[PDB]
Ligand binder design. Structure first.
Ligand SMILES: CC(=O)N[C@@H]1[C@@H](O)[C@H](O)[C@@H](CO)O[C@H]1O
Ligand SMILES: CC(=O)N[C@@H]1[C@@H](O)[C@H](O)[C@@H](CO)O[C@H]1O
Ligand SMILES: [Ca+2]
Ligand SMILES: [Ca+2]
Ligand SMILES: [Ca+2]
Ligand SMILES: [Ca+2]
Lengths: 137, 136
């Protein structure tokens, strides 16, 4: 658990985590490496307050309609879970999701999905911004 | 539970806050103590949870058993978690449960290396316990 103290310049504090809402243009796999290069991870969302926090930030802008997060299809377990291997606790799928395409998760704002989780089939060459997290664990 | 929402002395794991309380109580009084903490005795739905628990209790050597939130359900004629839910994950030690109308504990003794056992004295056998809240 971080304090506000531990958030590097330009990172937002919430719920004992530091978040970077990065506006670059990367694939999911490129976003994963980018977060690592900042000694961080693509964000993992363990509870509804963290989901509400994220939606608050993403609803503050309209340039972008998806941000990559630290979840994808796991071949070992044949399910969607976090990139650290942790199964989902909080479930954030938007209406009608997932599409079950064995892909990578973002927060999506498109038609009936109103800043909620979606799975995209292309984890390499679909470019977007991302959310990194430092949770000091 | 959010990862940083566990009150003081509690540990977060897989959406739950746990308390490993070492005051020794019989199974019923342990149930009551978890209720007083606005929680319940722990229910173990997965191998992941079981391993988290084993990692904590195999770390200490004072206690050989901890009370958890499983007991005989007459209605159903089987051990159930105290919320009424079915025991899906198989965390029993070799040849357990060996009798009905018991309560469950983690047991470190002979062939049971911190797995589930059934005890048939749910009042007067005192031990530590493990509480769980999902903060709902
Ligand atoms: C990269 C991304 O999330 N793209 C999403 C796609 O997966 C989804 O099928 C569609 C409809 O929900 O919204 C897209 O345009
Ligand atoms: C309190 C407790 O769990 N005691 C256990 C008992 O239920 C079990 O039959 C025996 C054999 O495993 O080890 C005991 O002493
Ligand atoms: Ca998180
Ligand atoms: Ca999709
Ligand atoms: Ca549990
Ligand atoms: Ca027994």
């Amino acid at each position: 658990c971080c304090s506000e103290d531990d958030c590097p310049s330009g990172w937002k504090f919430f719920g004992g985590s530091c978040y970077l809402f990065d506006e670059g243009s990367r694939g999911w796999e490129g976003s994963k490496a980018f977060c690592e290069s900042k000694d961080a991870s693509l964000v993992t969302v363990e509870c509804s307050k963290e989901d509400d926090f994220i939606r608050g930030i993403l609803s503050g802008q309209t340039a972008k309609h998806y941000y990559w997060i630290g979840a994808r299809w796991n071949e070992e377990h044949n399910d969607y879970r976090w990139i650290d291997g942790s199964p989902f606790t909080f479930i954030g799928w938007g209406p009608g999701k997932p599409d079950n395409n064995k892909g990578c998760l973002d927060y999506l704002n498109y038609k009936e999905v109103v800043w909620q989780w979606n799975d995209h089939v292309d984890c390499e060459n679909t470019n977007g911004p991302c959310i990194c997290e430092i949770d000091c664990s | 539970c959010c990862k940083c929402d566990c009150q003081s002395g509690w540990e977060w794991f897989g959406g739950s806050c746990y308390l490993f309380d070492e005051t020794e109580r019989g199974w019923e009084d342990s149930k009551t103590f978890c209720e007083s903490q606005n929680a319940a005795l722990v229910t173990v739905e997965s191998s992941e949870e079981d391993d988290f628990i084993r990692g904590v209790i195999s770390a200490q050597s004072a206690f050989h058993y901890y009370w958890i939130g499983g007991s005989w359900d007459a209605e159903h004629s089987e051990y159930r978690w105290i919320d009424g839910s079915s025991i899906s994950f198989n965390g029993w030690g070799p040849n357990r449960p060996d009798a009905d109308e018991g309560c469950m504990d983690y047991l470190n003794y002979k062939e049971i290396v911190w797995q589930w056992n059934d005890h048939q004295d749910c009042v007067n056998t005192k031990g530590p316990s493990i509480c769980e809240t999902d903060c709902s």
